[PDB]
Design a protein around this ligand. Structure first.
Ligand SMILES: [Mg+2]
Ligand SMILES: [Mg+2]
Ligand SMILES: [Mg+2]
Ligand SMILES: [Mg+2]
Ligand SMILES: [Mg+2]
Ligand SMILES: [Mg+2]
Ligand SMILES: [Mg+2]
Ligand SMILES: [Mg+2]
Ligand SMILES: [Mg+2]
Ligand SMILES: [Mg+2]
Ligand SMILES: [Mg+2]
Ligand SMILES: [Mg+2]
Ligand SMILES: [Mg+2]
Ligand SMILES: [Mg+2]
Ligand SMILES: [Mg+2]
Ligand SMILES: [Mg+2]
Ligand SMILES: [Mg+2]
Ligand SMILES: [Mg+2]
Ligand SMILES: [Zn+2]
Ligand SMILES: [Zn+2]
Lengths: 97, 120, 81, 25, 206, 87, 129, 96, 217
RNA sequence: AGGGGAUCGAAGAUGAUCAGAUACCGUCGUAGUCUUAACCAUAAACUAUGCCGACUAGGGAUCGGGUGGUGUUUUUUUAAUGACCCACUCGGCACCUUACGAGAAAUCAAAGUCUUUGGGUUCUGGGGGGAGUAUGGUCGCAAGGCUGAAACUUAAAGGAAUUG
């Protein structure tokens, strides 16, 4: 039977949230279940930052990273990302890293 | 690898457990000792033993090692115990929070007063 | 816990409880006399106004209503009885 | 068979038993 | 049944306050604690160390009360206690347990850690829990040092103290030793600062 | 528990807690018995002579062992203050 | 809404005891509650209590002791026909020798044993052991 | 106090509810429905004399393998037809 | 020869305790069985039931055998002892020991009237276990024991003459039933009947009065 | 029945896949998707957990209201404000640890205060299948909703936990 008292994911006192479409497979899913990651990352990357500031005007410039919120659909979230699978107890752990 | 088995490490423990007023840091004598005090059916194994209890002996000499507690450690400790000469009578007087001193008044008696405050 | 006197409870932790959940229930609001020194006599205003109380002769103000106790308008004195 | 589809299975079957009975009215 | 000059003394009072034995735990606060004495702001509750004394006296008055002072038992896995207990244990008949415990020590004769005492004393009922638990598997009384967060299930007689380090622990243990000697014991009368340094009973260095 | 003609029949008249006066029965091995030692003039703690109590497994399970001890020994006049029947 | 005044204060007394307690605060108090709480005291099952005068229905502080196992209320106050007063005790009492069915009669509130010696019957209230 | 009305006057409610929930009882339902007399080849009776039509050979059910020898009977009192077993070795010889 | 470990295993052989009722007065935890052997030799074994149980193993199936035993006299001392072990015999070897340790006392009493020598119980007492609750209704004399074959046997050994029983659960699973029946009669020195209201002066622990006559070496 | 019809898209047609491939993937795209007027009355409409009252145990968060302060931060001239901070108090959405207690268990501050069985009240269930079927009644434009059996069959279906 049951195997989460949060149930599927986070919704106490709402009854209907409203869905979001899966970034990876367009699957609908309630935004409370959304399993979300914040893809803050550099525009450039690793080795290109030198070549950036190199063949450029301006003093080092500024460099402004590119943020977007990702929403995964479980079977997407599971198939790759933050998910693994956890022990009966490790499951309970809400802590991130 | 040369990880000694349990039968090896086991014996050596109990060996040091009761023949520290004997033995040494030397294998060769610890070796000749074993035959005298313990009975085994193997030359290979006996050395196998001695070597390690010889090693065990070598590292006790520079601080205790777990498992082996031949009580001479617990009572070398006991007399080894002491320190101090300075205590905690100097200098000034027993500094306290308001309430701590309010406490004293509201129960106790003569106390060297020295009160500061606190903040958020 | 386990043994104590419900009959003679501390005047302090008694004090901190809800106005209904005391030993004998009773209020916690008060009354006061109020002056705006242009006057000579005083009016008696309940601590929780609901109505913005108006002075005796001069239609001046006196206080304002809130979510509980009243805000006594500016230049005013008092005493509780 | 799926629970769903068996409810549609039987749903259908009624709609026709109906049809046939109406032939008799 | 009240002695006479077994009151708290100023020489004692000074002792406890340098150790900061009256600096009971923060926000944290087991309901079971009336040993408090008014809250200092900056959230540090102050301990009525007179009661702290009185309990000590009682703890003594029970430690020295068991026919064989050797099945009286010290415990502390907490490094700020190991040098304390050991020293308490030397001065009085009591057998020490400093370092890791090891479970099955009161149940299971079949072990060699095995003890079977008539009174268990402990420092910090958190870390030492094993003792406090296993002792209750087998009607053993418990004496215990306690802060304001110390869990007092299965420990009778608390000694409202300060497991926040330093000297407090070390103090108390030395005091227990003091008064179990002063109780039915080769010591002495009145004030009697006691030959032994309180700084003895301390956790070492580095 | 007596009998027709006198005769104290039925073995074992069990103990009893002191803060709860529930029976303390055989298999409760979480119960207790704390002897406080009777002292005399100048420290000396008269051995083999005690004011004693018995705390039931339940009470010290719930953690009431300490408070209840305080209250009990204080009204036995061997703790001065510490406790207050009012709260 | 609050339905049998007896029932609550009764249960509380139980849950105090059970929780190892030694006092209970009960509300709202009443003639019935007292005269019941009277009878428990009469036979040793609780100590002494006190009526406090809220200017309402009342609060009672009970001092109980530990002797008491269970104090329960019968909730449709059934009619007992003097023959049946045995049947009741039998049903719910631990032994013959002690404990009481307490009940209500035109001749007063009382324990069946007294309602035996007085030979009057009526409605049924609760019990004590 | 879950479910049922505890009132001292709730007599009717209670006795009514019982009447209803006796219907969940198969033995009861059967008895008032008169399943006895209506269906079931025997009237309401313990036995019934009929007449043989054909001798039959029923293959048993699994995991048993056999040929279970019984007779198709036309019940005299009643009309209805029944297949009935002939117990013990042989015996099916005794019919016709 | 014995050779007892445990303080209490010593005071016993040392003829310093005469009855388990001391152990019971002082709720002392028995750990060495020969304690109760000397303390109570009128005990006799009773194997109630034996059942096979099996575990699958990464290499092996393991059918060890539960055995369930009831030791006792017929004067208020009973043990329910249960152990599975890879030989039937051995399981019945160990269980009896465990059943010996387990031995508890039984408050028995009178139905109605005073008369002589308790035939029945103090009160009604319920012992629940898993899904089985047993009830013990005190019966009048000559009622005998109203209980299933097993539970009847557990009570005779307990030395109980007149008592009714109701039961309630999956009784067919014996292990859970006796374990309840046991509790039900281990529940009779729990009941604070009024006769027991008196204050007995609160006895002193054998471990202290014969502390010297105890202790290790 | 009008309107609207971007998007996405039951049906249909396609391109590939497949042994097959009425699908999964891609394309095209009807109805639908939105709105007005009237219908339908169903969802795992879920917390798979009735409502009112009472009692039983610890902890930090938090949402709204209130109360308390020679609290911070806002400077002007101190306030007044507002936003913070600490304590306490109602009533909310929850989580934490405990297990006096409860359960077949998983777990439960209620699923606890139950053979020591009674605070008040509603509703449903009584082996599995036959079956939510037949029938009658009734609602609806329809699709369908509510109400709702039996003959027969059958020794198991089922729950939770353990080990493989
Ligand atoms: Mg599943
Ligand atoms: Mg929904
Ligand atoms: Mg036609
Ligand atoms: Mg039905
Ligand atoms: Mg045919
Ligand atoms: Mg005819
Ligand atoms: Mg059998
Ligand atoms: Mg469109
Ligand atoms: Mg298609
Ligand atoms: Mg194709
Ligand atoms: Mg198609
Ligand atoms: Mg529905
Ligand atoms: Mg859900
Ligand atoms: Mg809470
Ligand atoms: Mg404010
Ligand atoms: Mg099938
Ligand atoms: Mg079969
Ligand atoms: Mg399963
Ligand atoms: Zn996806
Ligand atoms: Zn004015």
């Amino acid at each position: 039977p049951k195997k989460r008292a949060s149930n599927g994911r986070n919704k106490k006192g709402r009854g209907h949230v409203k869905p979001v479409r899966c970034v990876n497979c367009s699957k609908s899913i309630p935004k409370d279940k959304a399993i979300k990651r914040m893809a803050i990352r550099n525009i450039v990357e690793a080795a290109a930052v030198r070549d950036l500031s190199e063949a450029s005007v301006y003093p080092e410039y500024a460099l402004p990273k590119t943020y977007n919120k990702l929403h995964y659909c479980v079977s997407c979230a599971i198939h790759a990302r933050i998910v693994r699978v956890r022990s009966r107890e490790d499951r309970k752990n809400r802590a991130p890293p | 690898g040369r990880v000694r088995t349990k039968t090896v490490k086991r014996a050596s423990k109990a060996l040091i457990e009761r023949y520290y007023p004997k033995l040494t840091l030397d294998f060769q004598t610890n070796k000749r000792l074993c035959d005298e005090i313990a009975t085994i059916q193997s030359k290979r194994l006996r050395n196998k033993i001695a070597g390690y209890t010889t090693h065990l002996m070598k590292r006790i000499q520079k601080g205790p090692v777990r498992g082996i507690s031949f009580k001479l450690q617990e009572e070398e400790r006991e007399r080894k115990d002491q320190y101090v000469p300075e205590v905690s009578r100097s200098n000034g007087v027993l500094n306290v929070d308001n309430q701590t001193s309010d406490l004293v008044k509201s129960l106790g008696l003569k106390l060297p007063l020295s009160v500061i405050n606190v903040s958020a | 816990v386990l043994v104590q006197d419900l009959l003679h409870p501390t005047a302090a932790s008694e004090a901190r409880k809800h106005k209904l959940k005391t030993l004998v229930q009773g209020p916690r609001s008060y009354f006061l006399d109020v002056k705006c020194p242009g006057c000579l006599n005083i009016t008696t205003v309940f601590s929780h106004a609901q109505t913005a109380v108006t002075c005796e002769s001069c239609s001046t103000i006196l206080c304002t209503p809130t979510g509980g106790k009243a805000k006594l308008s500016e230049g005013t004195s008092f005493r509780r009885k | 068979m799926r629970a769903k589809w068996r409810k549609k299975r039987t749903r259908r079957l009624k709609r026709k038993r109906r049809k046939v009975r109406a032939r008799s009215k | 049944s009240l002695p006479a000059t077994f009151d708290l003394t100023p020489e004692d009072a000074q002792l406890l306050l340098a150790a900061n034995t009256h600096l009971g735990a923060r926000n944290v606060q087991v309901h079971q604690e009336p040993y408090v004495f008014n809250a200092r702001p900056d959230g540090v509750h102050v301990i009525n160390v007179g009661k702290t004394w009185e309990k000590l006296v009682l703890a003594a008055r029970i430690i020295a009360a068991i026919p064989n002072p050797e099945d009286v038992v010290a415990i502390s896995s907490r490094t700020f206690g190991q040098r304390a207990v050991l020293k308490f244990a030397a001065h009085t008949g009591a057998t020490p347990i400093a370092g890791r415990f090891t479970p099955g020590s009161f149940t299971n004769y079949i072990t060699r850690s095995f003890k079977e005492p008539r009174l268990v004393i402990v420092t910090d009922p958190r870390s030492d829990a094993q003792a406090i638990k296993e002792a209750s598997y087998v009607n053993i009384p418990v004496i215990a040092l306690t802060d304001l967060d110390s869990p007092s299930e299965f420990v009778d007689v608390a000694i409202p103290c300060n497991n926040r380090g330093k000297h407090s622990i070390g103090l108390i243990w030395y005091l227990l030793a003091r008064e179990v000697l002063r109780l039915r014991g080769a010591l002495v009368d009145r004030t009697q600062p006691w030959s032994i340094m309180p700084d003895l009973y301390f956790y070492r260095d580095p | 528990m007596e009998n027709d003609k006198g005769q104290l029949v039925e073995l074992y008249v069990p103990r009893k807690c002191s803060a709860t006066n529930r029976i303390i029965k055989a298999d409760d091995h979480a119960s207790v018995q704390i002897n406080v030692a009777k002292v005399d003039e100048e420290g000396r703690a008269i051995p083999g002579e005690y004011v004693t109590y018995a705390l039931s497994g339940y009470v010290r399970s719930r953690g009431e062992s300490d408070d209840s001890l305080n209250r009990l020994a204080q009204n036995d006049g061997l703790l001065k203050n510490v406790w207050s029947y009012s709260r | 809404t609050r339905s049998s005044v007896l029932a609550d204060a009764l249960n509380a007394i139980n849950n105090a005891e059970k929780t190892g307690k030694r006092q209970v605060l009960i509300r709202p108090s009443s003639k019935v509650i007292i005269k019941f709480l009277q009878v428990m005291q009469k036979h040793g099952y609780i100590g002494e209590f006190e009526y406090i005068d809220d200017h309402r229905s009342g609060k009672i502080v009970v001092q109980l002791n530990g002797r008491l196992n269970k104090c329960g209320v019968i909730s449709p106050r059934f009619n007992v026909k003097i023959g049946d007063i045995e049947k009741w005790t039998a049903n719910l009492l631990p032994a013959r020798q002690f404990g009481y069915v307490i009940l209500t009669t035109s001749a007063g509130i009382m324990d069946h044993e007294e309602a035996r010696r007085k030979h009057v019957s009526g409605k049924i209230l609760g019990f004590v052991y | 106090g879950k479910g049922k009305p505890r009132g001292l006057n709730s007599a009717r409610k209670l006795r009514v509810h019982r009447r209803n929930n006796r219907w969940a009882e198969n033995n009861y339902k059967k008895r008032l429905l008169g399943t006895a007399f209506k269906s079931s080849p025997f009237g309401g009776s313990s036995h019934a004399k009929g007449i043989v039509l054909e001798k039959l050979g029923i293959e048993s059910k699994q995991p048993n393998s056999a040929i279970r020898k019984c007779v198709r009977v036309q019940l005299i009192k009643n009309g209805k037809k029944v297949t009935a077993f002939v117990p013990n070795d042989g015996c099916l010889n005794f019919v016709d | 020869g014995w050779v007892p470990v445990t303080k209490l295993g010593r005071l016993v052989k040392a003829g310093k305790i005469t009855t388990i009722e001391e152990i019971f007065l002082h709720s002392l935890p028995v750990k060495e069985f020969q304690i109760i052997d000397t303390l109570l030799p009128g005990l006799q074994d009773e194997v109630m039931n034996i059942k096979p149980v099996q575990k699958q193993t990464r290499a092996g199936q393991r059918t060890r055998f539960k055995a369930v035993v009831v030791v006792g006299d017929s004067n208020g001392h009973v043990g329910l002892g249960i152990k599975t072990a890879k030989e039937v015999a051995g399981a019945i070897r160990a269980g009896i020991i465990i059943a010996k340790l387990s031995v508890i006392p039984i408050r028995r009493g009178y139905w109605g009237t005073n008369l002589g020598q308790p035939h029945s119980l103090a009160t009604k007492t319920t012992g629940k276990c898993g899904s089985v609750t047993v009830r013990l209704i005190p019966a009048p004399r000559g009622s005998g024991i109203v209980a299933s074959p097993a539970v009847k046997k557990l009570l005779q050994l307990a030395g109980v003459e007149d008592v009714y029983t109701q039961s309630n659960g999956k009784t067919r699973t014996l292990e859970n039933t006796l374990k309840a029946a046991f509790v039900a009669i281990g529940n009779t020195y729990g009941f604070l009947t009024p006769n027991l209201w008196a204050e007995q002066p609160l006895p002193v622990s054998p471990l202290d009065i014969y502390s010297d006559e105890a202790s290790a070496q």
